[PDB]
From Swiss-Prot, chain A:
It is a lipid-anchor. Component of the small ribosomal subunit. Identified in a IGF2BP1-dependent mRNP granule complex containing untranslated mRNAs. Part of the small subunit (SSU) processome, composed of more than 70 proteins and the RNA chaperone small nucleolar RNA (snoRNA) U3. There is a cross-link at K166, K189 (Glycyl lysine isopeptide (Lys-Gly) (interchain with G-Cter in SUMO2)). The modification Phosphoserine is found at S156. The lineage of its organism: Eukaryota, Metazoa, Chordata, Craniata, Vertebrata. The modification N6-acetyllysine is found at K36, K124. This is Small ribosomal subunit protein eS8.
Swiss-Prot record, chain B:
This is Small ribosomal subunit protein uS17. The keyword tRNA processing does not apply. It comes from Oryctolagus cuniculus. InterPro entries: NA-bd_OB-fold (IPR012340), Ribosomal_uS17 (IPR000266), Ribosomal_uS17_arc/euk (IPR028333), Ribosomal_uS17_CS (IPR019979), Ribosomal_uS17_N (IPR032440). Component of the small ribosomal subunit. The ribosome is a large ribonucleoprotein complex responsible for the synthesis of proteins in the cell. Part of the small subunit (SSU) processome, first precursor of the small eukaryotic ribosomal subunit. During the assembly of the SSU processome in the nucleolus, many ribosome biogenesis factors, an RNA chaperone and ribosomal proteins associate with the nascent pre-rRNA and work in concert to generate RNA folding, modifications, rearrangements and cleavage as well as targeted degradation of pre-ribosomal RNA by the RNA exosome.
Curated annotation (Swiss-Prot), chain C:
One of its GO terms (molecular function) is structural constituent of ribosome. It comes from Oryctolagus cuniculus (Rabbit). The modification Phosphoserine is found at S88, S175, S176. This is Small ribosomal subunit protein eS6. Ribosomal protein S6 is the major substrate of protein kinases in eukaryote ribosomes. The phosphorylation is stimulated by growth factors, tumor promoting agents, and mitogens. It is dephosphorylated at growth arrest. Phosphorylated at Ser-175 and Ser-176 by RPS6KA1 and RPS6KA3; phosphorylation at these sites facilitates the assembly of the pre-initiation complex. The chain holds residues 61 to 237 of 249 of the full protein.
Amino acid sequence: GISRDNWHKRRKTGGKRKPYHKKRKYELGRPAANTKIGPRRIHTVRVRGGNKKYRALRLDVGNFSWGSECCTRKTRIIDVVYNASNNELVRTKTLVKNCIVLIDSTPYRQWYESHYALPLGRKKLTPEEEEILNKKRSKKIQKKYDERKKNAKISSLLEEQFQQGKLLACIASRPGQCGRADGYVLEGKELEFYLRKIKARKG
Amino acid sequence: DIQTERAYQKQPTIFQNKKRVKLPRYYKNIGLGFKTPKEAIEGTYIDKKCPFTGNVSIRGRILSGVVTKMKMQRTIVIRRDYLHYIRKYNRFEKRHKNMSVHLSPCFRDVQIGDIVTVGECRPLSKTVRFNVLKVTKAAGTKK
Amino acid sequence: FPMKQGVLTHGRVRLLLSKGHSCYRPRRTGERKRKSVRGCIVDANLSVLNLVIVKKGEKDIPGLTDTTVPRRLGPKRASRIRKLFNLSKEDDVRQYVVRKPLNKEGKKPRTKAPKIQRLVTPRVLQHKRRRIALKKQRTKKNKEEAAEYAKLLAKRMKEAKEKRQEQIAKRRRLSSL
Amino acid sequence: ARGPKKHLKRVAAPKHWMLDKLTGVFAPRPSTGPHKLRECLPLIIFLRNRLKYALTGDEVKKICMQRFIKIDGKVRTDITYPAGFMDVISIDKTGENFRLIYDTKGRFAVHRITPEEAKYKLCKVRKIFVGTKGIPHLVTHDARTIRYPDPLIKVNDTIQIDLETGKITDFIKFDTGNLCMVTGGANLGRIGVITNRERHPGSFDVVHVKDANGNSFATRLSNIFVIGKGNKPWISLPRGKGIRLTIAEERDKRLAAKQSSG
RNA sequence: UAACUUCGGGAUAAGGAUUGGCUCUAAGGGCUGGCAGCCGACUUAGAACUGGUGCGGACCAGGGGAAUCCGACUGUUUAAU
RNA sequence: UACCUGGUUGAUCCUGCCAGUAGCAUAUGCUUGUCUCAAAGAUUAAGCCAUGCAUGUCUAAGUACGCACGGCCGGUACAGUGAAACUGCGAAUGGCUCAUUAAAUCAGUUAUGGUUCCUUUGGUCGCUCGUACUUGGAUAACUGUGGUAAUUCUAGAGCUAAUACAUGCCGACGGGCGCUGACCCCCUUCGCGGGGGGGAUGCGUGCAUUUAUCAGUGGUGACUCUAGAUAACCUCGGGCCGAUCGCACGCCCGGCGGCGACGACCCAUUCGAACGUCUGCCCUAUCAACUUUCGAUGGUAGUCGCCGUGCCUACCAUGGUGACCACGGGUGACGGGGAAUCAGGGUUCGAUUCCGGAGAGGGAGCCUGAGAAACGGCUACCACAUCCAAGGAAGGCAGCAGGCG
Ligand SMILES: [Mg+2]
Ligand SMILES: [Mg+2]
Ligand SMILES: [Mg+2]
Ligand SMILES: [Mg+2]
Ligand SMILES: [Mg+2]
Ligand SMILES: [Mg+2]
Ligand SMILES: [Mg+2]
Ligand SMILES: [Mg+2]
Ligand SMILES: [Mg+2]
Ligand SMILES: [Mg+2]
Ligand SMILES: [Mg+2]
Ligand SMILES: [Mg+2]
Ligand SMILES: [Mg+2]
Ligand SMILES: [Mg+2]
Ligand SMILES: [Mg+2]
Ligand SMILES: [Mg+2]
Ligand SMILES: [Mg+2]
Ligand SMILES: [Mg+2]
Ligand SMILES: [Mg+2]
Ligand SMILES: [Mg+2]
Ligand SMILES: [Mg+2]
């Protein structure tokens, strides 16, 4: 069927190479996974050596890491906004390695609230939220959260994404072979690089 | 300047997003008594296939050649010259092989006709299996 | 050509059957073979119709319901014997196992009983004890070697300590002199 | 081909087995084990061709399947089990012990040893390796894995293992001066004291070594197997003491022994 | 894309494929103060979907090839055979 | 043993070839007492095949309620042989042939710090903090009813097993270690404040997988190596943590016991395999330019693959090879270790028993499996060909013999 072989194409000089053996089993390819966004569906493929690979066909959740604070939470994927390889792969919503996607802010917003005790985003304050931000707190731990206030300032670019309700992430795992949609949250210079690319693309 | 491609360009190891109130860069010595060029350390380029800054390891044979063409981008072609002995006539016979070599952009001043030292590596592309490890200017050609 | 469920057509068709399919018995492992099969719906072009009675009528039929044939074999797994006779967890099943009668010409009448399987026996408990016993030995061995290495490692780390102190002290001596 | 091979022609067998030509077409292919195919010695060859306890392939099968043969302290019922350097063959019923040691030529010589010498063996380490929880490991030349070794054991050292417990008793550090035995190459079977260690980064290091007669010979480091401090072996050496006598004086002692024997 | 050739031709040689609708994508420029803002005009290429395979849907719009005879060719000629 | 002789002329000395001369294969003719070795349908047809055989397999140790044999001691299941069938493994080795194949194969040399690896050997296998004195329902073998002209074709009914297929806990297990932390206590301070302790509850708490961050046990010439810490994840087409078997048979006050068999995740090992590095091949110029939006040479990001890589996709750049013979063609071309002839050089041969490649009439596509693009496995199409009730079924000798050509 599909072959990943070097004997079927031209030599360095440009001369045609005539094969000496037919297609081999170990020189095989398989159809692309083309992982979409939707309810979870993985098929397993038995591969060489008897091992397993996981074809993620539809995949909706995946855990992403906030590097600046080392907070890795499981998050739901919203949309695919940018892909460096092909503009056709963002018109369709397919997840491949190193494609810029949208993930919701809620798991990270909860962590920041319970770890710094500041409101981020949040342009009424519901009873569960107001109490964690104003709970009866002894002094011995008050200074603990007070010295944690010094580095509680996050990047400006991340702030308006938090009040919008969704972040920009980059997938690092290979979902068509691992079966996962893992990645990290964009920030810093890498964030402004992909923001102007998304902006100028719209025009 | 550096970000001239569609995807963000960065070294995979350096985490550039530490919270603060110059980018540190990854580099290594490749061994075998080869000195890492200075502009690979204070430079700002990136390269997957640079021996001193990418994830390629030097193994196998260490060869040498003379530069012939520099028209491809971050890869050149050198020419190896040697003699081939033929037993019937007891004479030699000049033969040549020219080969594709990945030139890292740290070796920034390279012209046609100088001697470069190339070390075998992982197959980088269809016809490239070697990186440049050092460059020696030809006779004269200093001015 | 046999009829098989699911074809849902009128005549004969060729299908690529495999292991687990009806009307095919593979020879090698993973072998598949095309065979002709007849459709699921019944028509006039066939020889036999296999019919099974799922509910009896009001009057006895001669060839079927008059004669009665028993099950040839009795239960063999320990749990199924309990289910047949509705036994508890404590009374033994070796007493209640159904025993086959053997009677043929020229031989002495005897009776035969199947070996019962999945039965709790003094043998299996001894095996269970042995499995746990090796767990004792394996965890004991790990602690001893860790502790034995730990103090030996200190001694080898100790000699490296003074070896560093003795060279700097003489280098203090060399700098002093 | 389409899978792993399972036969071995006689004329393609290793030369030191000393197999002949006209007995058969096939040679006993060593079973997979701790020693490489070309540097091992199958149990079939040792009992039928060397000791001559048997005559045919079936006779030795009866010998080893009565659990008479114990290799390195364990009973082996494989007629083609590969036994290699320094392995201790122990046939308890006849009261006899062996240790596979190269003689002055390229061959494994039969070497009867005392029962006290048969309780241990020496082995070269190949790897130093840290386990899952900081647990040190080392790998010997015959594929033994043993945990928590002495931290002073390095990659080219040799250790003395007690075959009953498989634990280290003492070790010899690889350094100049120590006695050596060459396990491979053109010089294998020779014995001498290590003289120099010349290292090539990337290539194979060479070891210069001279025997008791002052002859000097080199070899690659992968063929060096230290067998003692200074010039005292930790094992009993075979006849010839690992001194290779050239062809000139080999006949000189061959006939002079003959005219001494008559 | 051939024979042949006065090397200019033969030539639209001969012989094949595609062509709708809809929704998109990319490239191609000005003015003002390697950037930013404000303006645009038509084209080309590619992709997905989709119709009873239907698309230069009417109109417009070269049948072709192999040879022989004569006149080189363009041009002119018996208004009414 | 570094070798010559006849033949152009009326005669001579040359050039020069023709013919003699000696081996070595292939065939053929005539002849043929003994004995030891010994090649043998390669050359033309990798043309076509009747018939028979060439791959099966049980130990004390997976599943015996086939009186098929068989002991008596019964009734506490199974004495013990044991056909059959389920299960496991093997069938990817060997054997045959040389059609394809000209930097391809192959050879010597090196790399995998860029990967898979059944089996063997050695390690790991209460590290995990959460009906077990043993859980479930099917199915062969068997009994019985059948179909077809026909096959190693199978249907419906009745039973019954597992080391087949599934489900699944107790113990170690009593706690530690990280986060929270209600609270409490102590010291200093007028006091806020500052410092030091103990601390309920609750969450996590093994290895393997995937991602991100931090620090820098052991090793390398050189790691983005091995190990460590943190935050999470962990596929229902779920990953391991034993619901298996045999010999003996004892010790305590029902509980403990030895030696094995089998099976399992991972790491090493072995046998390898697969991609690469460098150098090396016959004739031909009446083959001088070749390759490229139908990948040609590179870049970036990915997809696929066991991994590296235009392997493939998208966007880019215009590259790459050649008179030092590229590209194209031919080969009566499988390569090599080798064979014949030989002064010193060489010339010719290598289908042929050892190593490596390829292929099973020609192509193509797959299943199972650690390993196959397998053909004494399957599915198509082409050619050829077999039985037939005319509805259908079956096929692959370049295996051993044997037959036609
Ligand atoms: Mg010569
Ligand atoms: Mg073979
Ligand atoms: Mg014409
Ligand atoms: Mg004419
Ligand atoms: Mg005219
Ligand atoms: Mg007119
Ligand atoms: Mg004349
Ligand atoms: Mg005459
Ligand atoms: Mg002649
Ligand atoms: Mg006679
Ligand atoms: Mg006779
Ligand atoms: Mg031929
Ligand atoms: Mg033939
Ligand atoms: Mg040909
Ligand atoms: Mg050929
Ligand atoms: Mg050959
Ligand atoms: Mg094949
Ligand atoms: Mg044939
Ligand atoms: Mg095939
Ligand atoms: Mg056959
Ligand atoms: Mg075969």
